[PDB]
Write a protein that binds this ligand. Structure first.
Ligand code: HEM
Length: 453
């Protein structure tokens, strides 16, 4: 297993020497965020690695990133990582490819406009009541609060409510079938010999597909797919039903499932990261509460234009996503041979935009390890959209981005209206990141939560 391991050597592209069969995969064990940053430091603008035999080209030049993510998205860099064994979930928008992706993305676009988001605002804001009640019971407990329990439950509640209109109280119904099924999405493929064998030996994917082996939790997929069909007999779901070029009843089920998959852990982790930064920066937290109280005096309920016009809240969310871009990197496959900034790259190679590394780059951000929301003041020069990519850029960016920001802002408004967050002896400071999957802390974020009354 070395046939491709001379590619970058031959092209002159720097990078860490791969091992036979494994490639550079052993360097993932410290975390992809750490590997990308150390490679950037060591090799510069562009470096090559191998996932088994698969060549991987990382690029950090904003102009080359623009060509990959926008200019040649339809012609060359249309799809992400080559598809693992996923069964009918291949129809999910995030896993679909080429013409099928273009159609599905186009059918779902009316669902994610800013106009539809303004309509669904009351359906989203209503989950703030449960959130505050849950956190109150934990705050009035006089003990540190494990944030991920509170905000994981909120993240699940909102994405499921906006999906199906079912108001589950995740935190208070641990044995609800929706709750237990969805939690299987956490730690997606952690140390699983199946995921690793797929990465090293991508030719095994059609074998596992033929055996009904899926990277997803089968029992979760089946429950959610069957749950979708029974409700159609009797919302994101309602928008897709009305749109029925057709969106088949299996394609529609794939979207319902993938929205929950994409929005659940991401929103939860970012929320918890945000409150860590506010607990460790009281002055930021107090400035934000000052702005919230000036817009919504006497804990007034949030409205749409009030959320959109909170500048410092927007800066705080953006600075949190700079420090903690939970997807770590963007990935595209060369569906044919392509020249990328003078480099001839073979068909099937992967191109990586190392979001985390570029977000912590001292060449673009002064004091890059510091939490400074003022970076995102609209008075300052615009932020290069190819350096700052927590949601990606171009035709294949995060379709739920607007919704995810709105959800997180509504959560942060309601808890900060009622509570203050400070560290305790059990708080890990500095926070250390995990080494697997989406960005999350090595130890669960715990904080002291005090009510403002
Ligand atoms: C803070 C929370 C979230 C973060 C950080 C996030 C981040 C991302 C990122 C980085 C991508 C990859 C885009 C690219 O490759 O350029 C992505 C894709 C996607 N996200 Fe999100 N996302 C979040 C919440 C959501 C939510 C709530 C939804 C669903 C409503 C969602 C649905 C998707 C979908 C469907 C894609 C695939 C897009 C496609 O291939 O057409 N995300 N997200």
């Amino acid at each position: 297993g070395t046939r491709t391991h001379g590619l970058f050597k031959r092209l002159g592209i720097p990078g860490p020497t791969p091992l036979p069969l494994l490639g550079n995969v052993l360097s993932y064990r410290q975390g992809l965020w750490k590997f990308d940053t150390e490679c950037y430091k060591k090799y510069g603008k562009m470096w090559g690695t191998y996932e088994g035999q698969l060549p991987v080209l990382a690029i950090t030049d904003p102009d080359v990133i623009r060509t990959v993510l926008v200019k040649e998205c339809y012609s060359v860099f249309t799809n992400r990582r080559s598809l693992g064994p996923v069964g009918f979930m291949k129809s999910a928008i995030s896993l679909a490819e080429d013409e099928e992706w273009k159609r599905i993305r186009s059918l779902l676009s009316p669902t994610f406009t800013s106009g539809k988001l303004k309509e669904m605002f009351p359906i989203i804001a209503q989950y703030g009541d449960v959130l505050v009640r849950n956190l109150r019971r934990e705050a009035e407990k006089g003990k540190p609060v494990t944030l991920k329990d509170i905000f994981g439950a909120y993240s699940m509640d909102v994405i499921t409510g906006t999906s199906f209109g079912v108001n589950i109280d995740s935190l208070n119904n641990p044995q609800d079938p929706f709750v237990e099924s969805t939690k299987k999405f956490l730690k997606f493929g952690f140390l699983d010999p199946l995921f690793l064998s797929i990465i090293l030996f991508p030719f095994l994917t059609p074998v596992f597909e033929a055996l009904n082996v899926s990277l997803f939790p089968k029992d979760t997929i089946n429950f959610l797919s069957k749950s979708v069909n029974r409700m159609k007999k009797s919302d994101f779901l309602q928008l897709m039903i009305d749109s029925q070029k057709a969106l088949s009843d299996l394609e529609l089920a794939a979207q319902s499932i993938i929205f929950i998959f994409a929005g659940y852990e991401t929103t939860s982790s970012v929320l918890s990261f945000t409150l860590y930064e506010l607990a460790t920066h009281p002055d930021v937290q107090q400035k934000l509460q000052k702005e919230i109280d000036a817009v919504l005096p006497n804990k007034a309920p949030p409205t749409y234009d009030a959320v959109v016009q909170m500048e410092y809240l927007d800066m705080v969310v953006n600075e949190t996503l700079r420090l903690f871009p939970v997807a770590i990197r963007l990935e595209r496959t060369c569906k044919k041979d392509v020249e990328i900034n003078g480099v001839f790259i073979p068909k099937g190679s992967m191109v990586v935009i190392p979001t985390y590394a570029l977000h912590h780059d001292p060449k673009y951000w002064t004091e890059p390890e510091e939490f400074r929301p003022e970076r995102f003041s609209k008075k300052k020069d615009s932020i290069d959209p190819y350096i700052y990519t927590p949601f990606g850029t171009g035709p294949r960016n995060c379709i739920g981005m607007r919704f995810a920001l709105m959800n997180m802002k509504l959560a942060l408004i309601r808890v900060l209206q009622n509570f203050s967050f400070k560290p305790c002896k059990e708080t890990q400071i500095p926070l250390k990141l995990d080494t697997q999957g989406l960005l999350q802390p090595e130890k669960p974020i715990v904080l002291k939560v005090d009510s403002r009354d």
